[PDB]
């Protein structure tokens, strides 16, 4: 009918057990995301992220998992999709890089939609908004270059 969301899967293993962190949701969600970054895994990231966005509220970057989506969903053509999905981690995740990461990234769709003019602006806000940040960083180039 349409209940394919029963809460389950959340404990994958391992549970940290030490001062630091260990099965830093970082690494295995850059792993995950890192599969939408793959060609040949872009589904496949949208299969692993999806655990971690939706079914990973106890992994720090439930966000910002997202965030890797968010440019990557992009690329992939979603230029109309994952535009809002930056939207949403950078709304979501206010610490994250991807607020910067994804500002210079999805940033960056804007003038493939024609705001190279307007969006443009984009870019210069993470510079000096996000400032030395994943977006700002990268965006740096866009103020310069392009």
Same mark, same amino acid.
């Given at each position: 009918?349409?209940?394919?969301?029963?809460?389950?899967?959340?404990?994958? !293993?391992?549970?940290?057990? !030490?001062?630091?962190?260990?099965?830093?949701?970082?690494?295995?969600?850059?792993?995950?995301?890192?599969?939408?970054?793959?060609?040949?895994?872009?589904?496949?990231?949208?299969?692993?992220?999806?655990?971690?966005?939706?079914?990973?509220?106890?992994?720090?970057?439930?966000?910002?998992?997202?965030?890797?989506?968010?440019?990557?969903?992009?690329?992939? !053509?979603?230029?109309?999709?994952?535009?809002?999905?930056?939207?949403?981690?950078?709304?979501?995740?206010?610490?994250?890089?991807?607020?910067?990461?994804?500002?210079?990234?999805?940033?960056?769709?804007?003038?493939?939609?024609?705001?190279?003019?307007?969006?443009?602006?984009?870019?210069?806000?993470?510079?000096?908004?996000?400032?030395?940040?994943?977006?700002?960083?990268?965006?740096?180039?866009?103020?310069?270059?392009?």
């Amino acid at each position: 009918m349409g209940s394919s969301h029963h809460h389950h899967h959340h404990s994958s !293993g391992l549970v940290p057990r !030490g001062s630091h962190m260990s099965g830093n949701a970082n690494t295995d969600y850059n792993a995950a995301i890192a599969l939408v970054q793959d060609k040949s895994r872009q589904d496949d990231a949208m299969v692993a992220f999806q655990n971690f966005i939706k079914n990973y509220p106890d992994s720090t970057y439930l966000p910002n998992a997202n965030y890797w989506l968010g440019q990557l969903n992009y690329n992939k !053509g979603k230029k109309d999709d994952a535009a809002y999905y930056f939207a949403s981690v950078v709304k979501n995740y206010p610490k994250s890089p991807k607020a910067a990461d994804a500002m210079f990234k999805v940033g960056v769709i804007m003038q493939d939609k024609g705001d190279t003019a307007k969006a443009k602006a984009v870019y210069q806000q993470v510079i000096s908004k996000y400032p030395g940040t994943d977006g700002a960083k990268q965006a740096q180039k866009r103020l310069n270059a392009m």
